[PDB]
Enzyme design. Structure first.
Site, PDB file in Angstrom:
ATOM      1  N   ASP A  80     -11.459  56.374  37.023  1.00  0.00           N
ATOM      2  CA  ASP A  80     -12.204  56.685  38.235  1.00  0.00           C
ATOM      3  C   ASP A  80     -13.526  55.904  38.231  1.00  0.00           C
ATOM      4  OD1 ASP A  80     -12.759  57.794  40.710  1.00  0.00           O
ATOM      5  OD2 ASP A  80     -12.067  59.803  40.151  1.00  0.00           O
ATOM      6  N   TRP A  81     -14.151  55.829  39.398  1.00  0.00           N
ATOM      7  CA  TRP A  81     -15.287  54.955  39.595  1.00  0.00           C
ATOM      8  C   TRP A  81     -16.511  55.650  39.000  1.00  0.00           C
ATOM      9  CZ3 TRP A  81     -11.118  52.875  40.670  1.00  0.00           C
ATOM     10  CH2 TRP A  81     -10.972  51.667  41.353  1.00  0.00           C
TER      11      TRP A  81
END
Ligand SMILES: *[C@@H]1O[C@H](CO)[C@@H](O[C@@H]2O[C@H](CO)[C@@H](O[C@@H]3O[C@H](CO)[C@@H](O)[C@H](O[C@H]4O[C@H](CO)[C@@H](O)[C@H](O)[C@@H]4O[C@H]4O[C@H](CO)[C@@H](O)[C@H](O)[C@@H]4O)[C@@H]3O)[C@H](O)[C@H]2NC(C)=O)[C@H](O)[C@H]1NC(C)=O
Ligand SMILES: *[C@@H]1O[C@H](CO)[C@@H](O[C@@H]2O[C@H](CO)[C@@H](O[C@H]3O[C@H](CO)[C@@H](O)[C@H](O[C@@H]4O[C@H](CO)[C@@H](O)[C@H](O)[C@@H]4O[C@H]4O[C@H](CO)[C@@H](O)[C@H](O)[C@@H]4O)[C@@H]3O)[C@H](O)[C@H]2NC(C)=O)[C@H](O)[C@H]1NC(C)=O
Ligand SMILES: CC(=O)O[C@@]12CO[C@@H]1C[C@H](O)[C@@]1(C)C(=O)[C@H](O)C3=C(C)[C@@H](OC(=O)[C@H](O)[C@@H](NC(=O)c4ccccc4)c4ccccc4)C[C@@](O)([C@@H](OC(=O)c4ccccc4)[C@H]21)C3(C)C
Ligand SMILES: *[C@@H]1O[C@H](CO)[C@@H](O[C@@H]2O[C@H](CO)[C@@H](O[C@@H]3O[C@H](CO)[C@@H](O)[C@H](O)[C@H]3NC(C)=O)[C@H](O)[C@H]2NC(C)=O)[C@H](O)[C@H]1NC(C)=O
Ligand SMILES: *[C@@H]1O[C@H](CO)[C@@H](O[C@@H]2O[C@H](CO)[C@@H](O[C@H]3O[C@H](CO)[C@@H](O)[C@H](O)[C@@H]3O)[C@H](O)[C@H]2NC(C)=O)[C@H](O)[C@H]1NC(C)=O
Ligand SMILES: *[C@@H]1O[C@H](CO)[C@@H](O[C@@H]2O[C@H](CO)[C@@H](O)[C@H](O)[C@H]2NC(C)=O)[C@H](O)[C@H]1NC(C)=O
Ligand SMILES: OC[C@H]1O[C@@H](O[C@@H]2[C@H](O)[C@@H](O)O[C@H](CO)[C@H]2O)[C@@H](O)[C@@H](O)[C@@H]1O
Ligand SMILES: *[C@@H]1O[C@H](CO)[C@@H](O)[C@H](O)[C@H]1NC(C)=O
Ligand SMILES: *[C@@H]1O[C@H](CO)[C@@H](O)[C@H](O)[C@H]1NC(C)=O
Ligand SMILES: *[C@@H]1O[C@H](CO)[C@@H](O)[C@H](O)[C@H]1NC(C)=O
Ligand SMILES: *[C@@H]1O[C@H](CO)[C@@H](O)[C@H](O)[C@H]1NC(C)=O
Ligand SMILES: *[C@@H]1O[C@H](CO)[C@@H](O)[C@H](O)[C@H]1NC(C)=O
Ligand SMILES: *[C@@H]1O[C@H](CO)[C@@H](O)[C@H](O)[C@H]1NC(C)=O
Ligand SMILES: OC[C@H]1O[C@H](O)[C@@H](O)[C@@H](O)[C@@H]1O
Ligand SMILES: OC[C@H]1O[C@H](O)[C@@H](O)[C@@H](O)[C@@H]1O
Ligand SMILES: OC[C@H]1O[C@H](O)[C@@H](O)[C@@H](O)[C@@H]1O
Ligand SMILES: OC[C@H]1O[C@H](O)[C@@H](O)[C@@H](O)[C@@H]1O
Ligand SMILES: OC[C@H]1O[C@H](O)[C@@H](O)[C@@H](O)[C@@H]1O
Ligand SMILES: O=C[C@H](O)[C@@H](O)[C@H](O)CO
Ligand SMILES: O=C[C@H](O)[C@@H](O)[C@H](O)CO
Lengths: 757, 355
Positions: free
Chosen positions: B253-254
């Site tokens: 995930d970012w």
């Protein structure tokens, strides 16, 4: 460097020589100290500077784990691999002794020989493993001791190599700085990251033996150990080698194995090679640089005097002062690197050819025999493979290092490996000649297809036409490897796979002979009933054919056995045997510990095709009457030099190499022919994460007649029964049960007993 | 602890794996770090090219209702909405349609679908609508079909979010913007989950996702038993890559990646978004991973497995011989990214009536 450089004292046998060494070194200017500790330009692989004022000449350091490389007028001995396979201490000594006479008589002061446990055999793909002996510390130990003794007894100083944990060619990254391109800017050498127990129980074992045998020098290896160059590793050179093993001689750099000036000087190096040799391309870190380091207070004159003393001890001890070697006359470097004419000196003595033959005949190892051997008097003989005849370009066509022929050249019989441990041949006795001589004696016919079976027009047709009518088909396979590279896999070399496919197609009586530097892949053919016998002849040197054919024809039974494990798959060995990476600082964690070659197989319950210590006769031997005689003990007084290896039972008077008991057994020739037999003893030493069993003895009975018996006898040293205590930093005999086993291989052990101190 | 099982290509990706290994074998350490870490471009994330072997940047693009931040596309109903149809045909056709629009906009990897993270421990979950049912069985079914739809359409999926990602509150993604750092402020909520529950409830939909051939999985922002999902060895190396035999890549995930070495050792294969978003969301590999390899801390072969897992999808879905068209929209947004946008109309007859 919390490991200080210990001063030489000359130890046991060299006391006299050491004293003359110190006397001479003490008169030396700083410039003379630097001249002798660094290589200069000359005809030999390496040359120490002269001390002309004091009448110390240039010393010729010359390559040769099979004898003087790059010279004519000599003999091509079998490789260490090949003597190992005899399991015959007599042949081990005599090979080195012969090699010794040729070295001395060509004019060599220092033989860059033998290979005494680096590489030992962590990977079966090692491009130069063949220069060694066994993939086993004990056995490598014994052969290392004897090879050293034979060389020194000829009056040539040894440089046992390569210290230490040098176990893959890939990324060995010798230091070089030529064509604007330095190795420092590409990749460091592989880092053997070895735990302490492993380094003592596995890698140091054979080096202890080379020290004990009086190896004058030792060569530090190309690899780093725990991320420090071997040639400047203080714990390696100053502590383990010069303190614990009490080594009194010189450490010589491998060629490009020295990477810096001051840590090398500080951490154990004695000699910088090759210095001004090889255009200085492999580094030249001392010489004038060392002069300045001494003059300006960076490195003590004392430290360098010790280096010079270690060099010069060997010189005096072997009597090269009062009995100088003759001049060396051959350019072994090669134009354009060195532009110098060569002389001519013939050094081959009566006896050498026959000794080379004998090593062959005692080594060739029978792996499969369904009934086709020995040969009687077949009338129609087929032969397949270029390995059966001459290199098509001549036996020394591949140059000074046996490595310059094209990747596809039919090199003929593989009588030696490639690289610094090779040597020229005056001729090759091809398998095809020897077979033909015998065929002619039997009024038989014989025909060979020696071309490249895949790329020569007509070759497959010629094979299909010839085999069906042949009474027996011999197939000669080979697998060249060299220093500088690891084998990518177990593939046969050249057109080997093809030759085998064809031969099992057109013939029901195929006898395979493999000349190889190491294990090969024969899984496709080995269980095929058309292959009636399989032999591996290793690297038999110039007498390849005449050594082999006597065994094929049953004139003498095969007695050789395997000095490593023949697995079915490379995937069955220790993992990460060769590490491939472009990482600036390549790592190899020896997490397997002591478990290499057969100890891996044994511990992990993997069955090989043919086990360490396996090899068939034309007879059988039954084992009886195991005796463990604790009253058969002896004090060690026989070694040439002593180590300082600490042990829990040191009483002040005794030794690690005392023989504490002797074990005996009886073999009986239980078949229908005379044969020689290699009896083997293994011990299971109790402890945690310990090997299932460890070779601790071998005895080869010669020419045992049918019906007869002979006693086989195994001295057991304290060290043979010891472990390394990492905590206490000494050797000790553990508590518990010691299984002692005896028989014909590492898997074929009919006699067992428990000893419990 | 829990070692990293090497990719082998599994059932359907056998030939793709082998092309991947071959390509990776040729790659320098720089190339390995180029492809395993995000660079700057128009898509939500972008893998560095291996330009010397002609491997191009991969466009990773949100999101689970279709390509986000593009013109010329259709707005599909949410996962929540298909779930309510209880119609397998619709679940598939939805994804297939989303799929053609992703492909035709030029996306290599769809950051979709949502396959059980969040699954629905709380009915207040802010993004629960992106998933499907509050039920492992039904969510597994929809997830299977959602994955198949997108992959049949020629777009690699990144199923998300693995795992136990059951609240938005204090997910605390990694961000080091201004002076301040989330790592100084507060660690992510730690989902602490027994082994029965992990098996029988949360892993169930992801198993379905793996079986459907999801090319990649995105590790979540939450920590599980006080270890980040994106560097949880039990979770990624053992549960996912061993027990579920997952053959594809784990994408952060970012800002879900919090460290360099544990991440490399414990299951992560792609660092996102890397240089994107001004580096504000962490940039722990790239040049850092090059250094760690070159100095012996991280094994090159460990990183080759990551790159293999990435290329497997590339080759399996045929993006090598049938490349997606150029992606043309700036979906990041100025001033974070100052790039002009093209235009592409991707809406096809049939889509409106499916919706
Ligand atoms: C988050 O934390 C939770 C809470 O602690 C974690 O839940 C624990 O998860 C572990 C598994 O990782 C689990 O371990 C077991 O307990 C069992 C008894 O309750 C043990 O019997 C079992 O052991 C076997 O499995 C091991 C792993 O393969 C083997 O090494 C071991 O030898 C045992 O297996 C042998 O024996 C059985 C027969 O008995 C045989 O079938 C096997 O094949 C083999 O021969 C586990 O060790 C804990 O019980 C869990 N605790 C709870 C309360 O659920 C959770 O894992 C954490 N999550 C993350 C992501 O980290
Ligand atoms: C490559 O790297 C490996 C990996 O580390 C490295 O392995 C280690 O080697 C060291 C030795 O250099 C091992 O050393 C020690 O740990 C022991 C505990 O496990 C410890 O007891 C040892 O003790 C002492 O010995 C030293 C050295 O003589 C001494 O100075 C101390 O005072 C301790 O000894 C005293 O007490 C003893 C009784 O308790 C007594 O018998 C003794 O005479 C003395 O009075 C030691 O420090 C270490 O454990 C190894 N680890 C592993 C993983 O194996 C290699 O050595 C490195 N190799 C190279 C070439 O660099
Ligand atoms: C690099 C090296 O090992 O050099 C030596 C010279 O002493 C070294 C010891 C070594 O045991 C010895 C004698 C051998 O006998 C080897 O079997 C041997 C080699 C292994 C071979 O060396 C190689 O294959 C190197 O890997 C190879 N390496 C590179 O080319 C290289 C260059 C820059 C950066 C990184 C790598 C090399 C080839 C040719 C010349 C120099 C280097 C050179 C060499 O000619 C032989 O080298 C030369 O004859 C030589 C080297 C440098 C300058 C001039 C001559 C080789 C032979 C005889 C063929
Ligand atoms: C540091 O080492 C250098 C390399 O060995 C030394 O130089 C060499 O010294 C040799 C004498 O020890 C010379 O050998 C002789 O050569 C001449 C030819 O010019 C003949 O007249 C002699 O008979 C011959 N002796 C023999 C071999 O029987 C070398 O010529 C000479 N080489 C070089 C490169 O010049 C340095 O002397 C040495 N320095 C110190 C301070 O000792
Ligand atoms: C006949 O002997 C030849 C040596 O004189 C031998 O050629 C050499 O074969 C080795 C394989 O063991 C090659 O190894 C190298 O190959 C490339 C070189 O670019 C490297 O990538 C590898 O790492 C490895 O170092 C040698 O290159 C090759 N030498 C030459 C000069 O071509 C033949 O193989 C022998 N013939 C047969 C049939 O075996
Ligand atoms: C590492 O990845 C970056 C990111 O893509 C690479 O650079 C781009 O290369 C493409 C071709 O593949 C060019 O069209 C772009 O102009 C490049 N972009 C930038 C920002 O310069 C880079 O080439 C990769 N490096 C290696 C060694 O493969
Ligand atoms: O920007 C998000 C909006 O959040 C609103 O609040 C949430 C609640 O306070 C609670 O559920 O916690 C989350 C964070 O875990 C909050 O986001 C409120 O703060 C608004 O200002 C925001 O628009
Ligand atoms: C001593 O000389 C060496 C070699 O020239 C050089 O590396 C070093 O800088 C010198 N050091 C001092 C203290 O002068
Ligand atoms: C040897 O001769 C070659 C060919 O003339 C020349 O190029 C080379 O430099 C010479 N070697 C040395 C070390 O002087
Ligand atoms: C063995 O050899 C014969 C020809 O002699 C051939 O026809 C047969 O197929 C071969 N069998 C095997 C197992 O290769
Ligand atoms: C290797 O590189 C990383 C990042 O550049 C650094 O954190 C680490 O300490 C380095 N380790 C060594 C042994 O140089
Ligand atoms: C050797 O172990 C160290 C950790 O102790 C690790 O950094 C290194 O990468 C290891 N090498 C291997 C097994 O690749
Ligand atoms: C984009 O433009 C704005 C305003 O023109 C500028 O402040 C900003 O730094 C730019 N963004 C980047 C990432 O360069
Ligand atoms: O990278 C070249 C490489 O080719 C061989 O196959 C390997 O075994 C290495 O020894 C060698 O360095
Ligand atoms: O291709 C066989 C072998 O060749 C050499 C090296 O490049 C290795 O990586 C490889 O295993
Ligand atoms: O040998 C005792 C102890 O020494 C050190 C390490 O190698 C340990 O793993 C080992 O158990
Ligand atoms: O801790 C240092 C040293 O202590 C003791 C042994 O257990 C070793 O394995 C360990 O490395
Ligand atoms: O399509 C790939 C495209 O991206 C990059 C550009 O620099 C172009 O050179 C290239 O053609
Ligand atoms: C080259 C080899 O590394 C070395 O062992 C030789 O002894 C020097 O020629
Ligand atoms: C933001 C979200 O956490 C993530 O799921 C996206 O896929 C990245 O834009």
């Amino acid at each position: 460097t919390q490991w200080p450089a210990p001063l030489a004292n000359g130890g046991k046998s060299w006391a006299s020589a050491f004293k003359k060494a110190k006397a001479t070194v003490t008169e030396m200017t700083v410039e003379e100290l630097a001249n002798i500790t660094s290589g200069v330009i000359g005809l030999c692989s390496g040359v120490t500077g002269a001390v002309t004022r004091l009448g110390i000449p240039e010393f010729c350091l010359q390559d040769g784990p099979i004898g003087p490389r790059g010279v004519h007028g000599s003999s091509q001995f079998p490789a260490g691999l090949t003597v190992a396979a005899t399991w015959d201490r007599t042949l081990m000594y005599a090979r080195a002794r012969g090699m010794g006479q040729e070295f001395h008589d060509q004019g060599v002061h220092l033989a860059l020989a033998p290979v005494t446990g680096g590489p030992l055999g962590r990977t079966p793909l090692n491009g130069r493993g063949w220069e060694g002996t066994f993939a086993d510390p004990y056995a490598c130990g014994e052969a290392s001791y004897l090879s050293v003794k034979g060389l020194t007894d000829a009056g040539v100083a040894t440089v046992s190599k390569h210290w230490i944990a040098y176990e893959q060619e890939t990324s060995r990254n010798l230091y070089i700085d030529i064509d604007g391109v330095s190795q420092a800017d590409i990749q460091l050498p592989i880092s053997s990251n070895v735990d302490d127990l492993t380094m003592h129980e596995l890698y140091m074992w054979s080096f202890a033996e080379a020290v004990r045998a009086g190896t004058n020098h030792i060569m530090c290896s190309y690899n780093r150990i725990n991320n420090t160059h071997s040639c400047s590793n203080a714990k390696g050179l100053n502590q383990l080698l010069k303190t614990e093993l009490n080594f009194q001689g010189g450490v010589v750099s491998d060629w490009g194995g020295q990477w810096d000036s001051v840590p090398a000087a500080e951490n154990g190096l004695d000699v910088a090679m090759p210095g001004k040799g090889f255009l200085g391309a492999l580094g030249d870190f001392w010489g004038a640089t060392l002069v300045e380091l001494i003059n300006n207070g960076t490195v003590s004159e004392d430290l360098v005097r010790d280096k010079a003393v270690r060099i010069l001890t060997g010189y005096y001890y072997l009597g090269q002062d009062t009995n100088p070697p003759p001049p060396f006359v051959y350019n072994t470097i090669g134009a354009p690197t060195l532009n110098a004419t060569s002389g001519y000196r013939n050094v081959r003595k009566p006896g050498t050819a026959e000794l080379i033959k004998e090593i062959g005949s005692a080594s060739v190892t029978l792996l499969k025999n369904t009934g086709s051997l020995p040969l009687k008097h077949p009338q129609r003989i087929a032969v397949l493979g270029n390995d059966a005849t001459y290199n098509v370009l001549g036996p020394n066509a591949c140059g000074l290092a046996n490595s310059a022929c094209d990747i596809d050249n039919l090199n003929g019989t593989l009588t030696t490996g490639g690289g610094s441990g090779s040597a020229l041949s005056p001729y090759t006795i091809t398998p095809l000649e020897a077979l033909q001589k015998r065929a002619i004696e039997d009024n038989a016919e014989i025909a060979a297809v020696v071309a490249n079976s895949n790329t020569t027009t007509g070759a497959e047709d010629a094979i299909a036409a010839l085999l069906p009518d042949a009474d027996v088909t011999f197939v000669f396979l080979n697998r060249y490897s060299e220093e500088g590279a690891d084998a990518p896999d177990f593939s046969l070399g050249g057109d080997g796979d093809n030759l085998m496919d064809l031969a099992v197609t057109y013939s029901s009586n195929v006898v395979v002979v493999i000349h190889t530097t190491g294990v090969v892949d024969i899984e496709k053919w080995a269980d095929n009933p058309n292959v009636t016998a399989i032999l591996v002849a290793y690297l038999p040197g110039q007498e390849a054919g005449n050594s082999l054919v006597p065994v094929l024809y049953g004139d003498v039974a095969p007695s050789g056995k395997l000095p490593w494990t023949w697995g079915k798959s490379i995937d069955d060995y220790v993992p990460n045997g060769v590490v491939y990476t472009d990482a600036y600082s390549p790592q190899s964690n020896f997490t397997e510990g002591v478990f290499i070659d057969y100890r891996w197989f044994d511990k992990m319950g993997i069955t090989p095709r043919y086990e360490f210590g396996f090899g068939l006769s034309y007879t059988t031997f039954t084992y009886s009457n195991l005796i463990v005689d604790h009253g058969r003990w002896a004090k060690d007084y026989s070694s040439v030099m002593e180590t300082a290896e600490p042990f829990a039972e040191w009483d002040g008077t005794n030794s690690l190499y005392d023989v504490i008991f002797t074990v005996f057994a009886t073999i009986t020739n239980t078949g229908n022919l005379t044969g020689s037999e290699v009896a083997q003893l293994y011990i299971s030493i109790p402890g945690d994460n310990q090997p299932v069993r460890q070779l601790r003895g071998f005895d080869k009975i010669k020419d045992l007649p049918v019906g007869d018996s002979a006693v086989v006898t195994f001295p057991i040293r304290r060290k043979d029964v010891s472990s390394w205590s990492v905590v206490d930093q000494l050797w000790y005999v553990p508590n518990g049960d010691f299984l002692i086993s005896v028989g014909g291989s590492s898997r074929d052990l009919p006699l067992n007993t428990t000893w419990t101190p």
